[PDB]
A paper describes a structure:
Unfortunately, we did not succeed in obtaining crystals of any complexes, either by co-crystallization or soaking. Structural superimposition demonstrated that although sharing a low-sequent identity the binding mode of the inhibitor, as well as the contacts with the hinge region observed in [name], could most likely be maintained in [name]. Nevertheless, other interactions observed in [name] might differ in [name] due to amino acid variations. This included the contact between the inhibitor piperazine and the αD D250 in [name], which might likely be absent in [name] harbouring N117 at this position. In this binding mode, the pyrazolopyridazine group was expected to still bind within the back pocket of [name] and form a contact with the β3 catalytic lysine. This structural comparison therefore suggests that [name] likely shares similar mechanisms for accommodating inhibitors to that of other kinases, enabling binding of various inhibitors that are developed for protein kinases from diverse families.
Extracellular signal-regulated kinase 3 ([name]) is a poorly studied member of the mitogen-activated protein kinase ([name]) family. Despite potentially important functions in cellular processes and tumorigenesis, no [name]-selective inhibitors have been published that could be used as tools to elucidate the roles of this kinase in normal and pathological signalling processes. To contribute to recent global research efforts on untargeted human proteins, we present the crystal structure as well as the discovery of inhibitors of [name], providing a foundation for the development of selective inhibitors for this poorly-studied, atypical [name] kinase.
Residue numbers in the entry: 147 to 483
């Protein structure tokens, strides 16, 4: 992989590598000068030569040709793919250049949460963009802070004596959504497993089928991370996740516990869980009812926490849609002149 990129390398006799932006399971994204587009800077994703990622990359291109044709102005803030190509048998996708991820900024800002007026603007653009997928019979399936990128990443730094550390604040918190490698059409085959551990919806964990709603869950989880600076679901393990869900959101619905073919996770009608074990005590300590995480009782926090609660509905049918989410009172303050 690194054998196929170094600063100075030229790709498709067009793109000159100046910087690695970041790496991942997929491969790496590099910043390039495009010599045949007036020296415009672009991001190029170089995909690991594994069929798994090869397949993912190829569908990502078909989804983005679709989204780009449907929204040529990029009004719904999906990342714009400019073109793609092959370099030593690795698939390469060229995008408009974006800054670092909402995850990166949190991490670099000392794992501090975003301030609320930024969460509102970011939550809206995430909901508008992902709803545009939902309007076009697509589910992203893999929403997480890492896959939400800032257009501009520039920030001011200032010492907050409220928290006794230096705090970084975005100038422009505008975001776009990336990684359509896992995006599935309503008419296409649905994988048994989708989404990253912490942002997996309960319908997905319990193998009850999934669709647009499994995205709304993930967003719910994103907005908590932004509010706190850490996930409220810190775990790799499936059963542990449901146990944390139970402590924060309350008991799983009767019908979902009934219908699930993953009966490994249940003992009659309750989660098969020794609360007095390694994972057990950890959950009792690390989790509490959702509303006990609110840092303020200010009206603006409660209306955010009402949306998060609506997004974390256990039943995907009842679960608020993003068309409704965009109407929620939390966003009234964006629409005031
Ligand atoms: C530890 N962090 C270090 C920073 N990393 C990082 C920062 C900025 C971009 N930029 C960029 N621009 C346009 C498009 C894309 C993009 C398209 N598709 N994808 N897919 C997955 C991830 C990014 C993108 N990325 C890229 C970076 F990797 C992430 C990992």
């Amino acid at each position: 992989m690194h054998l196929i990129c170094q600063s100075g390398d030229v790709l498709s006799a067009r793109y000159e590598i100046v910087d690695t932006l970041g790496e991942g399971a997929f491969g790496k994204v590099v910043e390039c000068i495009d010599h045949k587009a007036g020296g415009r800077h672009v991001a190029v994703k170089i995909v690991k030569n594994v069929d798994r990622y090869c397949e993912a990359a190829r569908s990502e291109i078909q989804v983005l040709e679709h989204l780009n044709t449907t929204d040529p102005n990029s009004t719904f803030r999906c990342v714009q793919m400019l073109e793609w190509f092959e370099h030593h048998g690795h698939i390469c996708i060229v995008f408009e250049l974006l800054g670092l991820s909402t995850y990166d900024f949190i991490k670099e800002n000392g794992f501090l949460p975003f301030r609320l007026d930024h969460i509102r603007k970011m939550a809206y653009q995430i909901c508008k963009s992902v709803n545009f997928l939902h309007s076009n019979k697509l589910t992203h399936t893999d929403l997480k802070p890492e896959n939400i990128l800032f257009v501009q990443s520039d920030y001011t730094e200032a010492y907050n004596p409220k928290i006794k550390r230096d705090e970084r604040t975005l100038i422009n918190p505008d975001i776009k959504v990336v990684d359509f490698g896992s995006a599935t059409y309503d008419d296409e085959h649905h994988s048994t497993l989708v989404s990253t551990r912490h942002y997996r919806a309960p319908e997905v964990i319990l193998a009850l089928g999934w669709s647009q709603p499994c995205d709304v869950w993930s967003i719910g989880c994103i907005l908590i991370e932004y509010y706190l600076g850490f996930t409220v679901f810190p775990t790799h393990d499936s059963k542990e996740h449901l146990a944390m869900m139970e402590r924060i959101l309350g008991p799983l619905p009767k019908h979902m516990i009934q219908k699930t073919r993953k009966r490994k996770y249940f003992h009659h009608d309750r989660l098969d869980w020794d609360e007095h074990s390694s994972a057990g005590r950890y959950v009792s300590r690390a989790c509490k009812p959702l509303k006990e995480f609110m840092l303020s009782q200010d009206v603006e926090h409660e209306r955010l926490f009402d949306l998060i609660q609506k997004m974390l509905e256990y039943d995907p049918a009842k679960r608020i849609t993003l068309r409704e989410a965009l109407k929620h009172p939390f966003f009234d303050l964006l629409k005031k002149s």
